[PDB]
């Protein structure tokens, strides 16, 4: 909810209701460094190929 609301630059609001539970697995949190590594890979993939 927070991330989608912040992304939309305050034009829409996002709501996602849910019941209380703990065995709900939604693996998405990663660190910035991993994203930076991935971007380095993506840039190096180009290799002057228009």
């Amino acid at each position: 909810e927070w991330a989608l609301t912040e992304c939309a630059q305050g034009y829409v609001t996002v709501t996602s209701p849910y019941a209380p539970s703990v065995n709900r697995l939604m693996p998405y949190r990663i660190s910035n460094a991993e994203r930076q590594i991935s971007q380095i890979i993506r840039i190096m993939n180009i290799g002057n190929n228009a």
Binding site: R42, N45, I46, G47, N48, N49, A50
Partner: protein, 141 residues
């Protein structure tokens, strides 16, 4: 028990609620389908660029083209494809014949291996030739 296939070859009482009636009269502007089609194109991942890398056997895949010539050809193909996308004979946005003298541009090709040598003869052929020049043989005569 659920089976998931692989997408890649591997090693081998009244109920009618008083508010649920549908009277739709709103036409989204911009339209939903128009935006969806555009988002589909941008959704696609970047294409692979595999040339110049060793294969399963150990031979660098790709073409035997000079790297600068490869860059020129890729630029030309990009311009051609851009022209095709906008449905024109000649492209308005060009990746080639710009004002910039990009003469030192290099593009990865299958001409050179990882040792800096030329692939005029593939790796496996060279290893085979080198190892063959020293094999022994049973005594004779």
């Amino acid at each position: 028990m659920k089976r998931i296939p692989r997408k890649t070859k591997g090693k081998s009482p009244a109920t009618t609620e008083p508010g649920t009636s549908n009277r739709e009269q709103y036409k989204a502007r911009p339209g939903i389908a128009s935006v969806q089609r555009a988002t589909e194109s941008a959704e696609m991942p970047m294409k692979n660029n595999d040339e110049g890398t060793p294969d399963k056997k150990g031979n660098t895949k790709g073409d035997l083209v000079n790297e600068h010539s490869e860059a020129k050809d890729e630029a030309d193909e990009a311009t051609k494809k851009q022209a095709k996308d906008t449905d024109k004979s000649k492209a308005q946005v060009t990746y080639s014949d710009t004002g910039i003298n990009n003469a030192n541009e290099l593009s990865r090709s299958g001409n050179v291996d990882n040792e800096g040598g030329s692939n005029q003869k593939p790796m496996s052929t060279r290893i085979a030739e080198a190892t063959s020049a020293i094999v022994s043989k049973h005594p004779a005569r």
